[model samples]
Structures are given as C-alpha cells and as structure tokens.
Target: EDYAEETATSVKFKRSVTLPGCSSPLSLLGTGFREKKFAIIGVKVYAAGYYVNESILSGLSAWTGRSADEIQRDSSLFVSIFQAQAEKSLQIVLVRDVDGKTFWDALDEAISPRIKSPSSEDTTALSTFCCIFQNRPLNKGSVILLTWINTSNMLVSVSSGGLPTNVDATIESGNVTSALFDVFFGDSPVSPTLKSSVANQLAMTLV
Candidate 1:
C-alpha cells in the first residue's frame, strides 16, 4: 500500500510488552474500566508520521524468536488497534474519538482488516501514547490531560495530535470534589458518588 518506509532507528524496547494487541472496548460488553482504564493519552504525530525505529524491527528477535516484521507489527498495534471484542453479529466501531474518527475506518482504508490493525507500521512510533478510543471529540487545539495510575519509575504522560510530551503527572494525590470528578469523567454521578476521592497530581505546560 506504499506506507512510508524508514531506515529503522533502534531503541531498547521493553523486555515483555505484548504488542499487536489493541485494547478492545469493554463497554461494548456491558463493562468499563475498573482498575486500569483505556485512554487516548494523545496523538503520536503532529506534522508528519513517526520515524521508523530499528529496535522494534529487530531488537526483540532473541526474546520473541519470531520475524522482525511480526515484532514490529505487534509494537505498532500495541496501543492503537481498537475493535469490538464481541460475542454477536454486530458491526461495531472499535475505537471512536470525540469527533467521530474511527480506528476501524483507518484500518479499512489503509490496509484492510487482515493485514494490520494499526496501519502505519514504519512511519509510526510510541504505542503507549496511542489511543483507540476517545469519548470526547478532538480538534487541532484540543487538550486531553489523561492520568492513569502508574509506578514511580514509569510516570504516565499526556498527549495531543500523537505528539506526546512528558509532562508532570506525578502522584501527589489528594481529595477530589465531585464537581471536579464530574468534569473529568464527563458524567452525571451515575455509578456512585465519586464524592471527595483522591486524585493524582496533574501538571501541564503551554506550547
């Protein structure tokens, strides 16, 4: 399909990160995020596509014992593929953003379903910063500051236009008013009163 080929720069990838697996929507199955939630941290590419990294291409051969292309595909699909995980005959939108952009649409247009889930293999990077779903529509200047629980070493990041800038999303947790939670979750206190719960320290910057 003529995807942008790359020289394949190398980086030390994770020892055991299962890629090529996108996060399916639990909500479609009458469930949602409990402990770990799936969030669109941000976009990975702002102006152009991602630089092809050789690390994903060949670094994990010894660990995976598979071809480099397979590893690369897994890495590329890791955080982006979002289709319906189902037990029925329904054509579902795997990942839907706030503005009605569907991941399945990209999958269908670029390479069809069988070849790849997240299409841009060589020209995309950072699966962790990828997103298969967005509850809110995003514009060019849309600001999405997402915070997932993380260990001290792997501090979570915020994203926009696929360009992830590591901001200060540290765990300086404190009580949260329902007003804040309502705005954050964009819900009307349906499940239970989030009522004065703890929230992590979320910081940002102006570009």
Candidate 2:
C-alpha cells in the first residue's frame, strides 16, 4: 500500500516518490500541509512531502535510538539532515489556487533569513530562483518539486497538474538550497507539523 497523509483538502501525500532527474526512488520522511491565515480563518494552501535518498540514513548513527520528541526538539538533527551527502527532495501539491508571486514572496521570506553573508553570486541565484515562479499560476493539484542533487546544486521542476518529469531549472548555491530545505526543517520552521512529522518518522526509521 502507498503510505499517505491526508491534507486539509483532498490531496494525499504519498510515502515514496521518484525525483524528476533521478533513477532511484526517495522515501518520504514526512507529510504535512501549509495554510494561509486571513483574520481568524485559515485556508489550506498545499500539501508537502519530504523525501530523501535512503543511503543518508546510514550516516545518522548519532541520532540512533532517539525518540520522536527528542528528535523534534533538537535543531542539530535537522541541520545534519540538511547537510547530508545524499539526495533530498521536497514535493509540494497545491490544494488551492494561488498567485506565483505570492507563493514566491512567502518562500522568499523563509529563505532570506537563513543565509548569512550573501555574495553577488548568491543574489543572482536567488533572483533566478524567484523568477521561476513569477507570473505563473499555481492551481489545485499543481506539483512543485525541488531536489538537491548534492551539497551545492538543486534541481527545480514545476508541474501544472502532475508529477514533473523534467528539470525546469537548477539553483547552484549551497546556501540557497540548504536554506530552502531549512525553511521547512529549520529551528523556526514555517510548518511545525512537517518538522514534527519528519522527526517522528526519522526516529522510527533510525530505530
């Protein structure tokens, strides 16, 4: 059976998925949803799935036998996962219609604070990354996949209504890639449910 998590909407995040450019399948570590608040009302925006190359788990011996609560409370564990020398992919499925600029703006807010001592190259890379979503329309069921090929490069693929099969662009900054991943898995994450779920799944996987 495909392991799945139900979002606030109709979308379900699958437990395992293959990346657009990779031959091997990545195992899902967690699944959660993002929401936008308007006054007291909260609207579900998208369902997100975090996946990683299975090989990376072998190197996380330091976190072995930790409980989910223990893992969730420790920021260092996530930092290590972000810096792991294996493929990492994030799959986002929009559950509601949203403007691309609005999506990028929210993402920019999360990614900006994480990078320190930004260089001209970093600025260029950030600009390129932002441009990918500019003037685009993100409708229900649209999939946006971001995959870290290594420590320095990330492949981004956006699909209007299906899982992407092609790489639309590549971000070549380690700071940007790591920061983006940290947006969901960092100390002050935008999605606490995602972080917690990942920690729980990671704890189970380790044990």
Candidate 3:
C-alpha cells in the first residue's frame, strides 16, 4: 500500500484529512512555509497546508475562468473564499521550536490588528485561545490544526507527536474567526507562498 502526502519546506502534510465533525474528507489545496527574515538570512518557522471541502467549488463559480496569477492578486477572491459556507482547515507543522507564550504573542499581534471593533465575547474568545499556549511549548514537528466548522466557529487542536485527537479550544466569535482566517488569507498574509499556492490550485480546480 502507498501513502500520500504533500511537502512544504520539508514538512509533510497528508493529502486529505477527515476532521472531527466533518462527514467527508477535506482535500488539501496547497502548501507553503511561514518564514521570517533576519537581515540577509531567512528563517523557516513552520509549514502549512490549506484544506477545504470539495463543495466549496459550487460557491466560487464567478472565478471559474481566472488564471492563477490573477487569482493570486485578487484580495476579494480570497475574502469570498473565507466567507464561503464550507468546512476549511489550516494545518501548521512547526519547523522550529517555539515556546507557547511566544507563539501566542506572534498570533496575537497579527489577529489583534484585524479586529476593528471587539465585543466582550470577542475579547473572551481571544483570551481563551491564548490559554492553549500559555504554558505549552511546541517542539519542532509539532502540529497545530485550526479547523473552521463555519465562519462563527473554529476548533483548534494540537499534537506534539502524531495527529491531534481532541480539540483544545473552540472560538465562537465570528469576528475572531474571520480575523484569524484573514491572518493567512487577507490583503496581507504572513505567507505569500501559501496564498499563491492556494490560488494556483484554485485556478486549476475552477477551470
């Protein structure tokens, strides 16, 4: 028997994942690495894969004929994808060691600025998310899964070894979830390659 997977910056991601609560498997659309540059050198922090239920295609008929390059540059297209009513997941595999607080801090910096107005519930949701990494340290190869059951609900799970079996937290704020999704798919993303790779695949899938 053969196993199937995809690679980004040397990290491996399965070709498909059947997330908890999802009836069918979600297909991997693309993979890329998140990197930070220090002077002349670049550091690879983690690799991530974007996955979605196949049914999402039906909602994107308007983009059926766009080229990959065109799709890559259109922020509106990605916004549409994020708002589409489909199960979507982002799987991140760490390529380097990171402490929990540091990880949360990095994510907070990105997500905080995206929320225009925060409700009390939104504040609670963000703090709830922060606790997942409060004392935990993620070693290299640790896997973090962010699965969006929908725009208003996001389930986060972590595994230091193999696949994560339980959700560590569920963010119930649509504002929080939308902002979180935007960190990777918004006008400016932490990973351009990830966005581009998804665009490339989307173009092929649409046409």
Candidate 4:
C-alpha cells in the first residue's frame, strides 16, 4: 500500500577476517609503497557477497574470459567498489602469461615476478587492502602497491597513482573501515528470515 510507511534496512559484519586466500596475495613493483603503506588494517567478511547490479568504472566492454556481460558488470562493480578507496587511482594484479619484455610498460603489463608474494596462510594472509596517500607515482621516485592475487589467468587495474599530500607523503594507515562496511552491508541488513531459511537447510555446513 502507498500509505504504508517504509522501513530502513541494515546489517553487520558477521566475522572479522584477515583476508581471503588464493595462490597469490598481492602484486607489486619496485616503486610501489610498503605493505602497511596502503591497506585496510582489518575487515569483517560476510558468509556471502551480495549481488551488485551497477558500477562506477567503464571502458571494459569485454574482460578476462567470462562468457557473459553480467561477468563484465560484476568486474566493473568490483573495480568501482575498490576504486572508491583510491584518493586518485588504483590497480589490480594477477599472474599474466605475457612476456617480460613489454611487461610493466603499460597498465596491461603485470610485474608480479619482481616482488615478494604475500603469505597464503589464513592468519598471515594479507587481504586486498587499499592505501590512499598524498604521494607520487610509483614509476617516479616513490612507491605504490597494487594489492591482489596473482594465481588467476585474468586480472584488473585502475589508477595506481597516490593522491597529493601536504608534506612529503609517507605511508599512513587509514581508519575508513566503518565507512566501507556501511556500503557493503547496508542494503542487506540483519535477515532473520534468511537466517531461519539457512538454519533449516545447510546450517551444518555453514561457517
């Protein structure tokens, strides 16, 4: 009924998790910042990710080897989601089959071999964290870390340059976790209905 008042929804980060696991944790170049330089210190991961029907970035009419546009939409949503953290830009990294000759020459070039890989174990796993700083471009005299995994055939990226800082920009920790959590779980607030539905089905298997 049009007269019925509306109800606002909300949700909470069910569990605090370090980061997800994959064959690779993060990809970096010599110029990129240190691990702590740009990262999400902590995060609360959910049992399942919600469906993203939109995006912020574009020019990715086709990507990786997905068989449909929805995959492309999902990729765009991910880039747009993370790009929100970049004061300027960000980048995605994964192992590429491309030869080293022209690798790193452009955004397509993946320079994973030249840097140390993050730990794969759960406790030590460095989840995909972002670092926004008043810093210079990595190719220049500073560093910029493109955090992600390198175990997949495809990867993604965005502006990796740091935003301008007042003084000589040094690596600093950001306290934007709560703000991000709001965006991620706001729409899917506490679902007692969903909880009951799960409890009756695969409750024993869920973690």
Query: Highest lDDT: which candidate?
Result: 3
Which residue pairs show backbone clashes in model 3? Answer: none
Deviation in Å, model 3, residue 34 alpha carbon: 0.4
Sorting all predicted structures by lDDT, with the top scorer first, yields 3, 2, 4, 1
- Note the Cα lDDT for every prediction shown: 0.23, 0.83, 0.84, 0.23
Which regions in candidate 2 have their CA more than 4 angstroms from the true location? none
Please give each candidate's TM-score.
0.21, 0.92, 0.92, 0.17
> In candidate 4, how many clashes are counted?
13
Query: The CA-based lDDT of model 3 is what?
Result: 0.84
Candidate 2: Cα lDDT at 182: 74
Residue range 34-152, candidate 2, lDDT tens digits: 88784499888888889998998988889999999999999888878877888889888888888756776787688767776787877888888777777778888889998988877
- lDDT string for model 1 (1-207, tens) is 222111121111121211111122111111111111236553221111111121222322233343423423342222211111211110111122334444334423333222333334311321322332334344443323223221111122333443243442332211111111222222222211111111000000000
Candidate 2 pairs with clashing backbones:
none
Which one wins by TM-score: 1 or 3? Answer: 3
Candidate 3 lDDT, 15-62, residue by residue in tens: 777876567789888888888864489788888889899998889999
Scanning candidate 3 in windows of ten residues, the lowest lDDT window is 1-10
RMSD to true structure for each model, in Å: 20.6, 1.7, 2.0, 19.1
Q: Sort all candidates by TM-score, best to worst.
A: 2, 3, 1, 4
